């Protein structure tokens, strides 16, 4: 009640199914504003905005990136993280992984979803574990360049993870600028490409046509997605409270089931 509720809050996000996607285009009708978008993060944004009694406007991140330390970016970070640092958006509501490095420059709510790094293969690929990848030659692998999975391997103290880091850093052509290009490479590489991909995306893709991909191995780590705000935001406490409210009242579970379980065609 002690923050501006006439302001339309700018919500940075990033198209990445099923978190956020464009509603299917139809004949003779043009969607505008937030109506263009659907998905888990759209439903989350709607519910958070309702909890806070605020208006909001989704504005997609202007470089298509989640956020990485970048010696060229103003404020030191690109992507949604940089938009928050530079006060170009008020909130980011996306599949933004909570990392120690990002917490030093922006604030996160408690997590609204838990996840881990996982492996996606085309069915038939003779890979069952991360260790397997490092013991063979024919299957190349990679991840989203410079995101949280990339940084996990760069920074990990586990020898296996450092071995995977050294390979990927020396073979950046086998990593990708969008996770969807990684998934296309899995599908189109005849069993010779594996993708390191966060488990909710992996699980979503594997459960839908063409049913040609699968997850192998245990998740490599455990972490969360959070709602992100620029430091000092007047909304920080209320947004965290709202996430906790939606977690306790079953609403986060409802929209997770909506976008993952209700959409299982395989």
Ligand X SMILES: N[C@@H](CCC(=O)O)C(=O)O
- Across the beta sheet with 55-60, the strand order is 55-60, 8-13, 91-92, 228-229, 107-108
The answer to whether residue 202 forms part of the interface with ligand X (CB under 6 A) is no
Residues 149-168 binding ligand X (CB under 6 A) are: 149
Stretch that binds ligand X, among 126-134, 144-152, 164-172, 247-255 (CB under 6 A): 144-152
Q: Could you say which of 66, 108, 112, 141 contacts ligand X (CB under 6 A)?
A: 66
Total site size for ligand X, rule CB under 6 A: 10
| Residue 16 beta carbon to ligand X: minimum distance, rounded to whole angstroms | 8
Comparison of 68 and 246: residue with beta carbon closer to ligand X:
68
Comparison of 52 and 58: residue with beta carbon closer to ligand X:
58
Comparison of 96 and 255: residue with beta carbon closer to ligand X:
96
The answer to whether residue 13 forms part of the interface with ligand X (CB under 6 A) is no
Tell me the two tokens of residue 140. Answer: 């190349």
Stretch that binds ligand X, among 25-33, 145-153, 232-240, 246-254 (CB under 6 A): 145-153
The answer to whether residue 144 forms part of the interface with ligand X (CB under 6 A) is yes
Rounded to whole angstroms, the Cα distance separating 172 from 74 reads 24
Rounded to whole angstroms, the Cα distance separating 206 from 182 reads 14
| Residue 171 beta carbon to ligand X: minimum distance, rounded to whole angstroms | 17
The answer to whether residue 213 forms part of the interface with ligand X (CB under 6 A) is no
Residues 80-139 binding ligand X (CB under 6 A) are: 95-97
| Residue 249 beta carbon to ligand X: minimum distance, rounded to whole angstroms | 26
Comparison of 93 and 96: residue with beta carbon closer to ligand X:
96
Interface positions with ligand X (CB under 6 A): 66, 95-97, 143-144, 147-149, 198
């Amino acid at each position: 009640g002690s923050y501006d509720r006439n302001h339309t809050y700018i919500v940075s996000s990033l198209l990445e199914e099923p978190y956020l996607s464009l509603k299917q285009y139809t004949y003779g009708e043009s969607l505008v504003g937030n109506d263009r978008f659907e998905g888990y993060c759209k439903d989350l944004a709607d519910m958070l905005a309702a909890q806070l009694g605020i208006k909001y406007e989704i504005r997609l991140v202007q470089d298509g990136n989640y956020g990485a330390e970048n010696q060229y970016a103003p404020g030191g970070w690109d992507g949604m993280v940089g938009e928050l640092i530079r006060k170009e958006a008020d909130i980011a509501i996306s599949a933004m992984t909570i990392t120690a490095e990002r917490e030093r420059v922006i604030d996160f709510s408690k997590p609204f979803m838990t996840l881990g790094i996982s492996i996606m293969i085309k069915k038939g690929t003779p890979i069952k574990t991360p260790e397997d990848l490092t013991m063979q030659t024919d299957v190349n692998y990679g991840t989203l360049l410079y995101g949280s999975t990339w940084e996990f391997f760069r920074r990990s103290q586990i020898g296996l993870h450092n071995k995977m880091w050294e390979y990927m850093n020396a073979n950046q052509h086998h990593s990708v600028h969008t996770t969807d290009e990684g998934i296309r490479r899995v599908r189109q590489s005849k069993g010779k490409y594996a993708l390191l991909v966060e488990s909710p995306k992996n699980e979503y893709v594997n459960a839908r046509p063409p049913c040609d991909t699968m997850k192998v191995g245990r998740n490599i780590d455990t972490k969360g997605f959070g709602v992100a705000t620029p430091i000092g935001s007047p909304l920080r406490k209320r947004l965290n409270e709202a996430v906790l409210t939606l977690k306790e009242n079953g609403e986060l579970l409802r929209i997770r089931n909506k976008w993952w379980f209700d959409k299982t065609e395989c």
